[PDB]
Design a protein around this ligand. Structure first.
Ligand SMILES: Cc1nn(-c2cccc(CCC(N)=O)c2)c2cc(N[C@@H](C)c3ccccc3)ncc12
Length: 261
């Protein structure tokens, strides 16, 4: 079933123009949509109701919307109201025309330290806002770390977010990220899916010796087996890793493909 060329809602009664395709997450396609009156551009998640015929799955998305809606912070994807018609649910979000930190990783492999310092900081500051507002992400991956044309990291995809394992799962996800950024490969990545889940359980990872001691030190703590021995969000910013070495405040767009100078 076709997705309407113009999108409208009963509430605000604003007309959006479905523009360029941006991607597809699971059963949700996403288009760059544009306000026909204001010309302000937004990323519109379009989920077809044929996926939400079951009231079970229809709850999970109504929770994702519930939470994301309440949020307001320069490191979480902006929320600008959802709406539905007879066929599709439409979630209107902040536009990030530089894709996700995953794309950056895939293209760059191991980034330089300052870049990880910059990304982690900004990422963590988002993670704090969440934890401060009693929100857990539970599903933090480089794909959830979107980038705008200013190279600001903005957290998205709250499809497994929950309001109040607890907070320590997020500190785990950020460990993997800081690993992947600095090391260039995910710490528990393997082709076999069962193998990954075993590696995680038995806590099987080895940080290469090429990585900075102070970096690895923190990476060990963030991935530590005892969730209660993992650092807190507030304890991250203050860590030697962020304070010892050079930390840039802005990043060039060049970082998407090559290292900065
Ligand atoms: C908010 C928001 N959700 N999505 C989005 C929706 C559906 C699927 C996907 C890809 C798979 C995934 N990572 O989940 C992303 C965006 C895409 C972009 N920008 C575009 C340029 C883009 C396209 C691919 C990946 C990242 C960004 N900006 C903001 C958003």
């Amino acid at each position: 079933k076709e997705i309407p060329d113009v999108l409208v809602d009963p509430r605000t009664m604003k007309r959006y123009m479905r523009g360029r395709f941006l991607g597809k997450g699971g059963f949700a396609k996403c288009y760059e949509i544009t306000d026909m009156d204001t010309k302000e551009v937004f990323a519109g998640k379009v989920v077809p109701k044929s996926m939400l015929l079951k009231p079970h799955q229809k709850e999970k998305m109504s929770t994702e919307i519930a939470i994301h809606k309440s949020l307001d912070n320069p490191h979480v994807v902006g929320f600008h109201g959802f709406f539905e018609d007879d066929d599709f649910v439409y979630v209107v979000l902040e536009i990030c025309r530089r894709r996700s930190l995953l794309e950056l990783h895939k293209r760059r492999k191991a980034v330089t330290e300052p870049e990880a310092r910059y990304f982690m900081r900004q990422t963590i500051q988002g993670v704090q806002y969440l934890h401060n507002n009693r929100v857990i992400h539970r599903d933090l991956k480089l794909g959830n770390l979107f980038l705008n044309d200013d190279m600001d990291v903005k957290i998205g995809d709250f499809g497994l977010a929950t309001k109040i394992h607890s907070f320590e799962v997020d500190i785990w996800s950020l460990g993997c990220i800081l690993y992947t950024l600095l090391v260039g490969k995910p710490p528990f990545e393997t082709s076999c899916l069962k193998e990954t889940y075993i590696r995680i359980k038995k806590n099987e990872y080895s940080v290469p010796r090429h990585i900075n001691p102070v970096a690895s030190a923190l990476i060990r703590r963030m991935l530590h087996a005892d969730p209660t021995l993992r650092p807190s969000v507030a304890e991250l910013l203050t860590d030697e890793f962020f304070t010892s070495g050079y930390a840039p405040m802005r990043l060039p767009t060049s970082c998407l493909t090559v290292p900065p100078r």
